[PDB]
Symmetry: D2
């Protein structure tokens, strides 16, 4: 599954529909990024630029011009064909091929942007620009507007109104099309296969980074070349560090390992966490904490639906956690009083859910305390966890246990669809999976 | 094999030995780099900063103070211990532990750099600073010097002389210690195992990116988490693109695939290229071009030694290439006249060799036209290639063939050591390797 | 005559009336400007900031908040009272006194602007800001908006719409109140007295700069401390240079001197040009050119009125000039054909008129080719000139003559009022004035 | 008196003598400075640039190249001849005329600086540059060095050492040539005539700014067009503000007026302060304070000589002040104890002396607490003062009195020459001067 030319075009048109007559929207590509000296990191297109183009080159700018309420057109600035540059560094789309390939009306060389952009903005009332997104982009836009402001003797005029299109565009991204959901479903499947593989491969004495290697190989074979974020493989005490990415330790017989990893497939993020015993068998202490996190996730998956909110579901999870921690003697006191005191926070210190899409921590307004009412088309994670620090003042057997279990869901008309349930999470299923692998 | 605390210390001392009395050298860490929105690329420390510290954190600055010809000391600025930041994002070395861990005299919080740096520079004659390396670093240094310049009423004075330490440090990096060579030897071995794996796994119908996946998994299992540069897997016509990294095509029965990939092991780069038939058997045309590139590499490996140069060895390769291309009818005319006209350049348009080390295209002065005389301790690649474009005016059977074969070598007292000869390159050996794999 | 607190307040209210509900307008003071090393030029407040405050301090920002269609208020950021800074550098208004003195609702310390500005913008829909006017201002505004954009977890929101208030404010400035016209009338009177003085003082052998000295002294004694622009005193060939400010030459018996000088009185510019003989008597050649420039000015003064334009009146002047130059043999051919060819342009190469106000070349839209229809309340100059270069291919006697004659006018309901007719311009009146002075 | 071409040349040569072989020094002109909108302040050349050129244009850069110990040459970048730009804005020196006019070897267009500067720096070991002096200059220099650093394949190399030439050049400026002293002597004479005029013109009811007008007119008539700093005319309580420049009050019968004003003559500053009664007669209270400041100045003028210091002479002044203030009951206690407590500081809170030259607060190292030993050729001010605030806890009659008396001196082989003694300062001489003027 992918996003096609006609969908990118529909998105451009939907933005144009929201724009004032006599305006232009400017969407800039990501800069290339140095890794060291003259070597660059693998290119990652800006999510918003990608959303409207599916075009994976730097030095590109999409300009949507809404001349009035019926007439609009698009102009792409992009790198020129250049035989020597292409022999060295790769093929370029160029100007001749872009209109047909991308479904834009006109294409111009990026090298000419300063000579041309002001001409496109001249006489417009409004420019939509994400000020501060990129320095290079602000320079180009500010230069164009200055030429227009200072150009009255050449009959030039600048648009006086600049509107940040990020809020409008991020609200578009928050609600996924069926095609987007299909892509996210595939990302979830790929990511789940990777996690299953990690559980089947994990043995005491392997290094945390070995599981990262297994996961990334699995992503790759299904055509998700890159992870959507830096893979976390936190064994033992390392699991208590939320974004542990050192992945440098030897995994010990008797420790849990917490894996938070997700692929990037056609631009879209998977995002799964599974925690499991390195040796294939939960200890009693590990199981006692695990059961509370799993109940939290299972209850959340029952509850998430249109008309509730992340805040409302979080309240249910907090009750589950406080209740469970009191039963184990990790917290002491009356459950309702402890809830009132947010007594869970030393052990569950992050949010239950974030939006998911072209960014793993995806764009879109959450509302105060993530109270926004959920609607069909929203995609989000569900990621309860409990982290008991090595020096926590709790019964000894729980110290140094970090557990998180995370699925990706889409809100539907009656509830939700779990995109990542194809990798096991019930403790008996984890143990059976690992037992079977360990016998081979 | 690795580089240890005492070696990092020896390097700092060797720099101090080269510094003027009454001076300070400032070496800054790399910034963290955005991949998309709030996600960052995996951190890569600045090579020069790494060379003197082995410290893999951002927000760090090494200050070497040479008070006079006998007295010197070191100060590290680095991130403070912070329980909440560490729970979220990972452990920090902090100030208490740094002197012992890194072998520096003092450690101070990076948050205090603007309050402290000017005090360390006050009254010195010379500051060594790599101006323009990083914007954030220039801001810090320029601010410190301004405070000193403007501080005469507070009895402050700025060093009037600023010296770029890059030339001195890059000349240090150009000559590897035995420990560095051991690390590079291991990088070469790891990288060679990865290339052997790619040849053994390659089958028609696999995608170029699948071989990338095999290679990166192999790097990872030996503890080289990341490649030293973006992997190139160019099959068919894609092999004619020097830094082809799209790796997006289905590999065809009858095409060659050119793989240029290298690991990063303890900071140091491997860098191997092998080209081989996708179906395990070179065609006659493919073999005819391959033989010329291989002879070029083999002759270069015989020749490279102290007292010759990249330029001198390149002349021998050019003769081999022109001679071979005339024999096949790709070039026409007298060999010596064609050499005089650089007639090989449409087909071999890049350099034979680059330095290798903490950067894949490593630092160090080459001399005019890479004429610098070679000495023991230099490490370099040997990477002849021939690329016959799909539209070249040559006998048809050669069109769309791109072949490069690259090894990594170290110059020794009598010649060179090949660090990457453990992956085959003779065509009969490539075919035997692939035949054996294809029968499994 | 001056502009008073209540008028500054009316202007602020008139801007607020034009603003969208749920918005804030930000108007920043001018930076102080270095002359050399640690010495600064005399402070000149930003015209727009002045227009809304009458406040002559740097490090000040006026914030007009329109909460909704009935509720609005003003906040001034300005320098705090500071006993030591004031002993050294001058008194400051401070926060306690500002509301009463300036008629603003609240005053806050400029040192707190970054801690406070984002709080004032939070939750607004629109911010009015003159982007690019000052770097320091853009930094402050961009920082505030970034804090808001990134502050969703603190329940902060940024206004998505930024509107340049310059067009609205400059249209306000283009139409003068009666009080403004009174101030401009006084500026015109002061400037005219200065020009009369220069004619009465001028003698052969004096330097051009001596007349500058006379003029500036005259400005000063009437309470116009500073000129509104750099005084031009161009004698002989120097008169052919439009903005000649070197003023370095000895004025020669037989040359004309062209003086373009104007005071700045309560922020408002006078702008007069008079040209006259250094020795008090026009030569025939000088008079022949002078008569054409004077007829051009006199006809323009008859014509300027509501309903015509600078472009229309310029056409009449061009005819006068071409006709006169043909009569003298400076141009050759048919007058209407020469007009069609813009044959006057080598000799009259600038505009007839510019707006006049808080800037000498005042703000406001002219329309294409200065075609905007004139209306009561506009204030403008009328400045025909003819400049015959020393090497012009014209009858010899005219070479090196530069003449400009300029008055300041206000458009009224039936025509115009000349603000600067109290300094003579008829050649017989100039000669009588100078003869009388030369006899003393 | 002036500074001539051959002296500017001698200075360039003296700098070259101090430079390392294989180096270039870069000295940049001042930017033009906006006053308001499209009007600029009168141009003031950068003092250091002026010191080496006597060239009063912007967009100019002096490059001194010391190829080795015997061979050196100079290159000026400056604005090209341009007929239209010159007709509009003034004559330009251009490239053809510059070598002869300024005594430089070569001149190139400023528009070509980025194409040419790197070529001049290529292969040098050292560049002398005043980093941070001007943003535009840093941009040009940093760009040149980057091209060289990145240009190894074009056989380019950057100088690795950058030296701030300000310390060397400012030490040159600290010691005046006889020609410089002649110019400063004339500045002192002009400035003294201006102060005498102010005393002769001052009457109760005039505004502070009227005396500014008299002073500036006097500067102008002697060919010092501009003041060297913003004129201070502080009457009554305003005299207690050290750099009072509002000059806005009506001068009252019974108040003193303190005038601190100085001309700029051929680039060099005069700097005189005189305080005198507005009505021509000191009151007893005024005279009592005045006598202490005058004794302080007179004693300083006796003492200043080679081999003493500003710090040493300041100690003598402090004793005079404390002794006098005890006698009047303004201070109470033992003189030596009060001196030990710096009890004078509420009333004399600034330094006695600053260097004087191309800047009024001139360049040059003072040493700790201005302890540097004086030598012939140094030029400095002597400016004791006493300021008794309106709310000081002192006998009532002294409240609101601010007195400063300042002369400019040059250190000579036996003592000093007073450059400004031609304007009276003894109270009986001030009164006689004013009485005589008031009778006219
Ligand atoms: Cl391009
Ligand atoms: Cl820190
Ligand atoms: Cl403040
Ligand atoms: Cl130029
Ligand atoms: Mn997540
Ligand atoms: Mn996750
Ligand atoms: Mn290589
Ligand atoms: Mn390679
Ligand atoms: Mn004018
Ligand atoms: Mn004018
Ligand atoms: Mn002074
Ligand atoms: Mn002074």
């Amino acid at each position: 599954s992918e996003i096609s030319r006609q969908e990118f075009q529909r998105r451009r048109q939907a933005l144009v529909e929201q724009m004032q007559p006599g305006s232009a929207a400017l969407i800039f590509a990501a800069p290339e990024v140095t890794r060291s000296a003259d070597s660059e990191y693998p290119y990652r297109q800006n999510s918003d630029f990608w959303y409207f183009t599916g075009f994976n080159e730097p030095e590109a700018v999409l300009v949507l011009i809404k001349s009035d309420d019926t007439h609009n057109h698009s102009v792409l600035f992009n790198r020129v064909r250049d035989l020597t540059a292409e022999i060295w560094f790769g093929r370029r789309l160029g100007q001749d091929a872009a209109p047909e390939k991308l479904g834009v009306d006109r294409a111009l060389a990026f090298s000419e942007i300063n000579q041309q952009l002001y001409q496109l903005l001249n006489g417009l009332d409004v420019v939509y620009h994400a000020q501060g997104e990129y320095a290079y982009a602000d320079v180009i836009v500010n230069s164009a507007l200055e030429k227009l402001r200072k150009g009255s003797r050449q009959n030039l005029t600048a648009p006086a109104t600049m509107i940040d299109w990020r809020p409008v565009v991020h609200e578009m991204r928050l609600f996924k099309s069926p095609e987007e959901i299909a892509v996210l479903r595939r990302a979830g499947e790929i990511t789940a296969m990777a996690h299953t593989r990690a559980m089947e491969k994990c043995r005491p004495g392997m290094f945390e980074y070995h599981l990262e290697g297994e996961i990334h190989h699995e992503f790759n074979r299904h055509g998700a070349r890159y992870p959507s974020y830096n893979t976390i493989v936190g064994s033992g005490e390392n699991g208590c560090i939320l974004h542990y990415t050192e992945n440098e330790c030897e995994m010990r017989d008797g420790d849990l390992v917490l894996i938070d990893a997700g692929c990037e497939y056609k631009g879209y993020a998977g995002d799964i966490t599974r925690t499991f015993p390195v040796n294939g068998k939960f200890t009693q202490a590990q199981r006692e904490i695990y059961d509370i996190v799993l109940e939290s996730l299972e209850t959340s998956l029952r509850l998430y639906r249109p008309g509730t909110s992340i805040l409302e579901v979080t309240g249910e999870v907090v009750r589950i956690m406080v209740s469970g921690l009191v039963k184990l003697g990790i917290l002491k006191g009356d459950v309702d009083e402890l809830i009132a005191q947010n007594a869970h926070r030393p052990f569950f210190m992050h949010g239950l859910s974030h939006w998911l899409g072209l960014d793993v921590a995806d764009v879109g307004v959450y509302g105060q305390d993530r109270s926004r009412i959920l609607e069909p088309g929203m995609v989000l994670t569900v990621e309860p966890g409990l982290y008991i620090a090595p020096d926590a003042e709790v019964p000894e057997q729980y110290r140094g246990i970090g557990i998180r279990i995370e699925d990706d869901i889409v809100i539907t008309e009656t509830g939700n669809e779990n995109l990542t349930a194809s990798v096991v999470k019930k403790p008996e299923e984890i143990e059976a999976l690992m037992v079977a692998a360990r016998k081979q």
